[PDB]
């Protein structure tokens, strides 16, 4: 007989950065 | 491949060859001296230089097993799989025999562990560190790396025992050797001179030369099969190579008219250090680098810079004045540093900074954000032009129309030592002759009369007149006739006023008196 | 030209390999086929496969997966290398190559298998794609794919028609030239759907294939001297340069149809066209103009219609601010990316404005953009008659009164007049319909003169 198996590895996220303006 | 298939990278190739083969050829020497040899190399340089070719050649010349690992290939999204891939690769390499592991583009899988956010990157970094160093880490197997930016790697990876050796794989003789070795298997011709190729292709990395040769060889057959013993008398000629190059300016000491003394001085000061390094080493002194041009606009300063850049085998990086400033904090200085790093990364090179009045501006004091930005830009330029550098071969050439607004730190000797002034009918005759080189002319036209009626025009005005004459000739067609010049002469511009001429004369007189 | 190029590239390295070896060049081995969909890349692949008795191992894109994709790639390459000097067709490479920025493993396998072909293999590869941008530059590197063709008609459409419909009891009164002429944009499969729907309509006709079946199967499927010189001048400039060798730009200004003239250029000039608005393109503000002109020079020839030039140039001068610095950088980018156009790559910039005062004389200089086209009653009558083409007009109506009353107007506000007349007629129709809730199908089927006389009140 056969059998199943579960697997959950990872995902992908998004970050936000701040910049500085010298006019 | 083999050791004979490598050219130009002579010293680094020899160093890698000895450090890899001496353990393999005979380990008795290292047993006698009682020290283990280095077991890691970090190659760095621009892409397409021949680094993986060198690794493959060394692996072929020795009884090794070249195993290639790509950066993006091994990285995956699954958890605990990329590390398993690296472990399996190392186990395979160590299983069979003493081998060479070439892991390409490690910078993609070595993000310094601080600027990254994905846990898989840190995990594979740690796996690499454990594999290279640790309990029974390596047993007679060497690893080779490759990257474009060696800075973006873990400090733990640039340690001894992992990447103890760093090799810089970045000239004319190497380029000629590559040309010779890439055309060894084809009979090109009898009148093809490789000196022009080694002098004209002055910006080729080395992998582009193979593409150039293949393209020329393919185009030779492409042009020699439209109509068609045929195998006899086959091969490429100079025309095919020129076409391949056509598929970085086109001037040679002819498009510039007049200014003979300026031409001679520039030619001497630029060609002497390039042609005779031996003489300067005997005299034990460095050459002058900087030249500044000032005068009215549209006089031919860019043309002169291109004309003095072309005869040498140097590159040419022309940047406008305001073509680098940014609204952000530290972007202009980053651009300046990148420009100079590129300029000194391919020696010799001439850098043409245009409109210094926009960059220098005589920083002094302005009390503003723009003032601070100008101060920082000026300081960065000052440090790069003459600072904690090596000044191998860099020829900064300046060009502005308002030298009075330059700080006395860039005009200082050693940065822009030569203060050349660029200012006649006899010169205008030469300018017209150089402009009308390849043109069907009429015997009846007299350029002397045209030059006599200028009385203070610039080369831009002469080019405008020539363009109007060409437009009239094309309008008539749809040789150049005299009436086109007659009707185009009336519509003169004379964009340069008189007060600016007085200002330039005063500046030149003050400089001469100083 | 593309057929002659691909015929040379599939005949000369495949029949005379010894001659190819004799030259001493071993690069031709990979050909790429890009372009818009429905042009005939799969048809050229089938013609290549049916003009040669060589082996033909077709492998499509997503049919390679099930560690067996690498085994499938190695199996296909060793099968094509083992039998004969042959050709491999890899259709829809955009699924296998995901531009890289098990897919990484199969891309690395295709890279190391395309590179590992020696002189004794003598096999070439052909690959078709739909979009030309989502391909690896490592796949477009020197060694695998360098010679791409750009397959960018009525005779081929007649050939496809005579290929498909010749296997049916067709008719006795058909002219397939008319079916090839009236069908304009179909490609490959839509003509097959046309014949299939013709058969379906014939079966629907004889249940409750003549020309009429194909007819509604096609129907049920999917400033005179100024325009003469402008069109004529553009044609002469983009024509053969041999006359020019023996011996680009334009500007509109006025109070009239300048953007209308640019639209008429954009439709009926037989050249490419790329248009941007005025302040639409505002380091990123220079990178926008840089890659817009890169897109222009890539698809040569083209027309870059810069609408509302004053907003961009503004005659840089002195403004002394952040807006002044942005204006100076925009003007310098435009000047240094237009003056670098030689006789090659033949782009052509068309400008239009309302205020010609505020344009920069540094952009009105000779050598960059020197022409100055200055831009009536008959054109107004023609504009009103062209706007009212597909409109049920009232028969007792003349537009010469609207042409004579309106003097200094323009095409956009003439469109506004026609749209206000349509709005008033729609209001009358919905009011009559709710009042009726029998009249005809429409109580006001045509736009009367009263609707125009009430719509011109607020014009
Ligand atoms: N020094 C060299 N000698 C001979 N061939 C070279 C050299 N440098 C580059 N090449 C050519 O460039 C091609 C690919 O270069 P490669 O070494 O893969 O680039 P990279 O250095 O980025 O790995 C090879 O086929 C090789 O013939
Ligand atoms: N002495 C000269 N001989 C030939 N052409 C010239 C000369 N001076 C100027 N020109 C022409 O006029 C133009 C001058 O532009 P450029 O030198 O870049 O401006 P600037 O002189 O302000 O640096 C060039 O295109 C060049 O062909």
Cα–Cα distances in Å, from C47 out to C52, C188, C244? Answer: 9, 14, 41
For chain B, say whether C100 makes contact (Cβ under 8 Å). Answer: yes
Please tell me whether B148 is known to bind a ligand. Answer: yes
| Residue B47 Cα to ligand 1 middle (Å) | 9
Instruction: Considering only the beta carbons, identify the residue of B73, B208, B231 that sits closest to C105.
Output: B73
Q: What are the b/e assignments for B158-190, b being 16+ CB within 10 Å?
A: beeebbeeebebbeeebbbbbbebbbeebebee
Gap between the Cα atoms of B352 and B400, Å rounded: 11
Ligand 2 atom at minimal distance to the Cα of residue B299: 21
- Element of type H or E holding B487: helix B482-490
Q: Do B474 and C244 touch (CB under 8 A)?
A: yes
Gap between the Cα atoms of C324 and A23, Å rounded: 12
Phi, psi of B185 (to 5 degrees): -100, 10
Output the CA torsion B472→B475→B476→B478 (10° steps): 160
Contacts of C372 (CB under 8 A, 6+ apart): C251, C253
CB B154 within 8 A of CB B125: yes
Contacts of B303 (CB under 8 A, 6+ apart): B251, B255, B256, B459
Q: Is B45 in the pocket of ligand 1 (CB under 6 A)?
A: no
Q: Are strands C147-150 and C250-253 parallel, antiparallel or unpaired?
A: unpaired
Question: Among B132, B105, B131, which Cα is nearest to B51's?
Answer: B105
Ligand 2 atom at minimal distance to the Cα of residue B255: 4
- Ligand 2, atom 17: closest residue by C-alpha: B300
CB C316 within 8 A of CB C360: yes
Gap between the Cα atoms of B159 and B40, Å rounded: 10
Neighbours of B198 (CB within 10 A): 22
Q: Do A22 and B329 touch (CB under 8 A)?
A: yes
CB C17 within 8 A of CB C85: yes
* Strands ordered across the beta sheet of C250-253: C274-276, C302-307, C347-353, C250-253, C373-374
CB B94 within 8 A of CB B86: no
- The helix-helix angle for B260-275 and B301-310 (nearest 10°) equals 30
Q: Which two tokens stand for residue B52?
A: 């993986």
CB C110 within 8 A of CB C73: yes
Closest chain B CA to residue C336: B320
Q: Which two tokens stand for residue B149?
A: 């930016």
Instruction: Considering only the beta carbons, identify the residue of B78, B119, B327 that sits closest to A22.
Output: B327
- Element of type H or E holding B398: strand B395-400
Helix (H, G, I), strand (E, B) or coil at B319: strand
Ligand 1, pocket-test mutation among B17, B53, B180, most atoms within 8 A of CB:
B53
Q: Are strands C56-60 and C87-91 parallel, antiparallel or unpaired?
A: parallel
- Ligand 2, atom 19: closest residue by C-alpha: B298
Q: Counting ligands in written order, which one lies closest to the CA of residue B423?
A: 2
Q: Taking the alpha carbons of C437, C438, C441, C447 in that order, is the dihedral positive or negative?
A: negative
In degrees, rounded to 5, the angle at the alpha carbon of residue B343 between the alpha carbons of residues B339 and B347 is 170
Gap between the Cα atoms of C216 and C213, Å rounded: 6
Listed by the residue before each break, gaps in chain A with C–N over 2.5 Å are none
Q: Taking the alpha carbons of B158, B162, B164, B168 in that order, is the dihedral positive or negative?
A: negative
Helix (H, G, I), strand (E, B) or coil at B351: strand
Gap between the Cα atoms of B213 and B210, Å rounded: 5
Q: Which two tokens stand for residue C6?
A: 């691909």
Question: Among C412, C341, C349, C406, which Cα is nearest to C377's?
Answer: C406
Gap between the Cα atoms of B59 and B315, Å rounded: 35
CB B102 within 8 A of CB B66: yes
Q: Taking the alpha carbons of B251, B253, B257, B262 in that order, is the dihedral positive or negative?
A: positive
Phi, psi of A19 (to 5 degrees): -120, 165
Q: Counting ligands in written order, which one lies closest to the CA of residue B295?
A: 2
Q: Which two tokens stand for residue C147?
A: 């010679």
For chain B, say whether A5 makes contact (Cβ under 8 Å). Answer: no
Gap between the Cα atoms of B368 and B376, Å rounded: 12
Helix (H, G, I), strand (E, B) or coil at B280: helix
Count Cα neighbours of B285 within 13 Å in the Cβ-side half-sphere.
Answer: 6
For chain B, say whether C441 makes contact (Cβ under 8 Å). Answer: no
Q: What are the b/e assignments for C284-304, b being 16+ CB within 10 Å?
A: eebebbeebbeebbeeebbbb
Gap between the Cα atoms of B300 and B294, Å rounded: 11
- DSSP letter for each residue of B352-378: EEE-HHHHTS--S---SHHHHHHHHHH
Neighbours of C162 (CB within 10 A): 11
Eight-class DSSP state of B341: H
CB B177 within 8 A of CB B8: yes
Beta strands in B245-300 (DSSP E): 291-294
Q: Is B6 in the pocket of ligand 1 (CB under 6 A)?
A: yes
Residues of B within 8 A of A20 (CB-CB) are: 328-329
Q: B400 has which bridge partners?
A: B294
CB B170 within 8 A of CB B345: yes
Gap between the Cα atoms of C89 and C59, Å rounded: 6
Q: Do B327 and A10 touch (CB under 8 A)?
A: no
Eight-class DSSP state of B144: E
Cα–Cα distances in Å, from B50 out to B10, B166, B186, B210? Answer: 12, 16, 22, 11
Neighbours of A9 (CB within 10 A): 11
CA distance C291 to chain B (A): 16
| Residue B71 Cα to ligand 1 middle (Å) | 19
Contacts of B20 (CB under 8 A, 6+ apart): B58, B62, B100, B142
Q: Are strands C56-60 and B66-69 parallel, antiparallel or unpaired?
A: unpaired
CA distance C253 to chain B (A): 23
Q: Do C23 and B217 touch (CB under 8 A)?
A: yes
Q: Do B468 and C366 touch (CB under 8 A)?
A: yes
Q: Which residues 104-163 of C are in CB contact (within 8 Å) with B?
A: 104-105, 107-108, 112, 142
Binding-site residue numbers of C are 37-43, 130, 164, 256-260
Q: Is B302 in the pocket of ligand 2 (CB under 6 A)?
A: yes
CA distance A15 to chain B (A): 9
Q: Is B318 in the pocket of ligand 2 (CB under 6 A)?
A: no
Residues of A within 8 A of B327 (CB-CB) are: 21-23
Contacts of B311 (CB under 8 A, 6+ apart): B252, B253, B267, B270, B271
Q: B299 has which bridge partners?
A: none
Cα–Cα distances in Å, from B40 out to B43, B100, B101? Answer: 10, 10, 10
- DSSP letter for each residue of B76-133: -SSTTTHHHHHHHHHHHHHHHSS-EEEEE-GGGG--TTTS---HHHHHHHHHHHHHHS
Listed by the residue before each break, gaps in chain C with C–N over 2.5 Å are 66, 101, 152, 208, 222, 247, 255, 282, 375, 437
- Ligand 2, atom 18: closest residue by C-alpha: B302
Question: Among B393, B389, B185, B175, which Cα is nearest to B277's?
Answer: B393
Q: Taking the alpha carbons of B421, B425, B430, B432 in that order, is the dihedral positive or negative?
A: positive
Helices (H) and strands (E) in chain A, counts: 0, 0
Gap between the Cα atoms of C57 and C74, Å rounded: 12
Q: In chain C, what is the straight-line distance between the N-terminal and C-terminal CA atoms, in Å?
A: 54
Gap between the Cα atoms of C376 and B146, Å rounded: 70
Residues of A within 8 A of B330 (CB-CB) are: 22
Burial of B20 (0-12, 13-18, 19+ CB in 10 A): buried
- Element of type H or E holding B421: strand B418-421
Greatest pairwise CA separation for chain A in angstroms: 71
Give the 3-state secondary structure of B36-88: CCCCCEEEECCCCCCHHHHHHHHHHHCCCCEEEECHHHHCCCCCCCHHHHHHH
CB C101 within 8 A of CB C137: no
Beta strands in B287-333 (DSSP E): 291-294, 315-319
Q: Is B297 in the pocket of ligand 2 (CB under 6 A)?
A: yes
The data reach a resolution, in angstroms, of 3.3
Q: Is B40 in the pocket of ligand 1 (CB under 6 A)?
A: no
In degrees, rounded to 5, the angle at the alpha carbon of residue B289 between the alpha carbons of residues B288 and B295 is 110
Gap between the Cα atoms of C145 and C5, Å rounded: 15
* Strands ordered across the beta sheet of B165-168: B66-69, B100-104, B142-147, B41-44, B165-168
For chain B, say whether C233 makes contact (Cβ under 8 Å). Answer: no
Neighbours of B446 (CB within 10 A): 11
CB B150 within 8 A of CB B104: no
Q: Residue C25: which region, alpha, beta or left (left: phi > 0; alpha: psi -120 to 50)?
A: beta
Q: Which two tokens stand for residue B282?
A: 């005997």
Eight-class DSSP state of B287: P
For chain C, say whether B235 makes contact (Cβ under 8 Å). Answer: yes
Q: Residue C85: which region, alpha, beta or left (left: phi > 0; alpha: psi -120 to 50)?
A: beta
Ligand 2, pocket-test mutation among B249, B294, B299, most atoms within 8 A of CB:
B299
- To test the contact with chain C by mutation, choose from B74, B222, B227, B243 the residue with the greatest count of C C-beta atoms within 10 A, namely B222
Please tell me whether B52 is known to bind a ligand. Answer: yes
In degrees, rounded to 5, the angle at the alpha carbon of residue C62 between the alpha carbons of residues C61 and C68 is 105
Cα–Cα distances in Å, from B248 out to B273, B437, C319, C394? Answer: 22, 21, 36, 68
| Residue B3 Cα to ligand 1 middle (Å) | 13
Q: Is B273 in the pocket of ligand 2 (CB under 6 A)?
A: no
Q: Which two tokens stand for residue B210?
A: 């193979």
Ligand 1, pocket-test mutation among B50, B70, B147, B149, most atoms within 8 A of CB:
B50
Gap between the Cα atoms of C375 and C261, Å rounded: 10
Q: Residue B105: which region, alpha, beta or left (left: phi > 0; alpha: psi -120 to 50)?
A: left
CB B335 within 8 A of CB B360: no
Q: Residue B278: which region, alpha, beta or left (left: phi > 0; alpha: psi -120 to 50)?
A: alpha
Gap between the Cα atoms of B152 and C333, Å rounded: 33
- Ligand 1, atom 10: closest residue by C-alpha: B207
Count Cα neighbours of B391 within 13 Å in the Cβ-side half-sphere.
Answer: 17
Closest chain A CA to residue B376: A22
Neighbours of C159 (CB within 10 A): 13
Q: Residue A13: which region, alpha, beta or left (left: phi > 0; alpha: psi -120 to 50)?
A: beta
Q: Do C23 and B211 touch (CB under 8 A)?
A: no
For chain C, say whether B231 makes contact (Cβ under 8 Å). Answer: yes
CB C156 within 8 A of CB C186: no
Residues of B within 8 A of A19 (CB-CB) are: 328
In degrees, rounded to 5, the angle at the alpha carbon of residue C286 between the alpha carbons of residues C281 and C289 is 55
Ligand 1 atom at minimal distance to the Cα of residue B45: 21
In degrees, rounded to 5, the angle at the alpha carbon of residue B197 between the alpha carbons of residues B191 and B201 is 165
- Cα B141 to chain centroid, rounded: 37
Gap between the Cα atoms of C415 and C413, Å rounded: 5
CB C60 within 8 A of CB C92: yes
Q: Is B235 in the pocket of ligand 2 (CB under 6 A)?
A: no
Q: Counting ligands in written order, which one lies closest to the CA of residue B259?
A: 2
Contacts of B297 (CB under 8 A, 6+ apart): B401, B458, B460, B496
Contacts of B507 (CB under 8 A, 6+ apart): B294, B403, B404
Burial of C256 (0-12, 13-18, 19+ CB in 10 A): buried
CA distance A12 to chain B (A): 8
Helix (H, G, I), strand (E, B) or coil at B145: strand
Q: Taking the alpha carbons of B21, B23, B29, B33 in that order, is the dihedral positive or negative?
A: positive
| Residue B433 Cα to ligand 2 middle (Å) | 14
Q: Do B329 and A20 touch (CB under 8 A)?
A: yes
CB B235 within 8 A of CB C24: yes
Give the 3-state secondary structure of chain C: CHHHHHHHHHHHHHHCHHHHHHHCCCCCCEEEEECCCCCCHHHHHHHHHHHCCCCEEEEECHHHCCCCHHHHHHHHHHHHHHHCCCEEEEECHHHHCCCCCCHHHHHHHHHHHHHCCCCCCCCEEEEECCCCCCCCCCCCCCCCCCEEEECCCHHHHHHHHHHHHHHCCCCCCCCHHHHHHHCCCCCCCHHHHHHHHHHHHHHHHCCCCCHHHHHHHHHCCCCHHHHHHHHHHHHHHHCCCHHHHHCCCEEEECCCCHHHHHHHHHHCCCCCCEEECCHHHCCHHHHHHHHHHHHHHHCCCEEEEEECCHHHHCCCCCCCCHHHHHHHHHHHHHHHHHCCCCCCCCEEEEEEECCCCCCCCCCCCCCCCCCCEECCHHHHHHHHHHHCCCCCECCCCCCHHHHHHCCCCCHHHHHHHHHHHHHHHHHHHHHHHHHHCCCCCCCCCCECHHHHHHHHHHC
Gap between the Cα atoms of C384 and C260, Å rounded: 13
Eight-class DSSP state of B174: H
Question: Among C380, C379, C387, C383, which Cα is nearest to C420's?
Answer: C387
Gap between the Cα atoms of B137 and B142, Å rounded: 11
Contacts of A7 (CB under 8 A, 6+ apart): none
CB B101 within 8 A of CB B69: yes
């Amino acid at each position: 007989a056969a059998a199943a198996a579960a697997a959950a590895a990872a995902a992908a996220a998004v970050a936000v950065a701040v910049a500085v303006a010298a006019a | 491949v083999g050791y004979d298939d490598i050219g130009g990278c002579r010293k680094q190739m020899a160093q890698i060859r000895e450090m890899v083969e001496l353990p393999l050829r005979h380990p008795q020497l290292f047993k006698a001296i009682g020290i283990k040899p280095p077991r890691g190399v970090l190659m760095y340089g621009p892409p397409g230089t021949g680094k993986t070719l060198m690794a493959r050649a060394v692996a072929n010349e020795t009884g090794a097993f070249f195993f290639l690992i790509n950066g993006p290939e091994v990285m995956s999204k699954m958890a605990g799989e990329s590390e398993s891939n690296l472990r399996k690769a190392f186990e395979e390499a160590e299983k069979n025999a003493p081998a060479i592991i070439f892991i390409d583009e490690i910078d993609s899988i070595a993000p310094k562990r601080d600027k990254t956010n994905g846990e898989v990157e840190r995990r594979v970094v740690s796996q690499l560190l454990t594999l290279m160093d640790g309990m029974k880490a390596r047993s007679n197997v060497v690893v080779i790396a490759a990257t474009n930016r060696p800075n973006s790697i873990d400090p733990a990876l640039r340690r001894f025992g992992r990447f103890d050796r760093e090799v810089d794989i970045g000239d004319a003789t190497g380029r000629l050797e590559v040309l010779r070795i890439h055309t060894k298997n084809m009979k090109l011709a009898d009148d093809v001179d490789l000196e022009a190729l080694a002098a004209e292709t002055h910006g080729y990395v080395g992998a582009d030369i193979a593409s150039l040769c293949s393209e020329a060889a393919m185009q030779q057959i492409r042009e020699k099969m439209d109509l068609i013993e045929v195998l006899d008398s086959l091969g490429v000629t100079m025309d095919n190579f020129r076409f391949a190059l056509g598929n970085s300016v086109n001037v040679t000491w002819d498009d510039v008219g007049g200014l003979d003394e300026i031409k001679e001085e520039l030619k001497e000061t630029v060609e002497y250090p390039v042609l005779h390094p031996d003489q300067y080493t005997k005299f034990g002194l460095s050459p002058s680098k900087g030249v500044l041009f000032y005068g009215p606009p549209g006089t031919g300063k860019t043309l002169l810079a291109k004309a003095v850049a072309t005869e040498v085998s140097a590159n040419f990086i022309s940047v406008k004045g305001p073509e680098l400033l940014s609204m952000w904090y530290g972007e202009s200085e980053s651009n300046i540093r990148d420009i100079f790093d590129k300029a000194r990364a391919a020696a010799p090179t001439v850098v043409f900074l245009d409109e210094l009045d926009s960059i220098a501006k005589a920083r002094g004091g302005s009390l503003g954000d723009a003032g601070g930005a100008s101060d920082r830009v000026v300081n960065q330029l000052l440090t790069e032009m003459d600072g904690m550098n090596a000044k191998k071969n860099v020829f900064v050439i300046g060009a502005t129309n308002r030298p009075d607004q330059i700080d006395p730190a860039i005009l200082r000797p050693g940065r822009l030592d030569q203060l050349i002034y660029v200012p006649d009918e006899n010169a205008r005759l030469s300018i017209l002759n150089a402009q009308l080189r390849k043109t069907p002319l009429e015997p009846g036209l007299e350029l002397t009369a045209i030059a006599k009626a200028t009385q203070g025009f610039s080369g831009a005005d002469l080019l405008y007149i020539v363009q109007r004459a060409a437009k009239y000739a094309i309008k008539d067609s749809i040789y150049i006739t005299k009436e086109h010049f007659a009707e185009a002469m009336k519509t003169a511009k004379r964009s340069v006023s008189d007060a600016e001429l007085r200002r330039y004369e005063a500046y030149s007189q003050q400089m001469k008196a100083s």
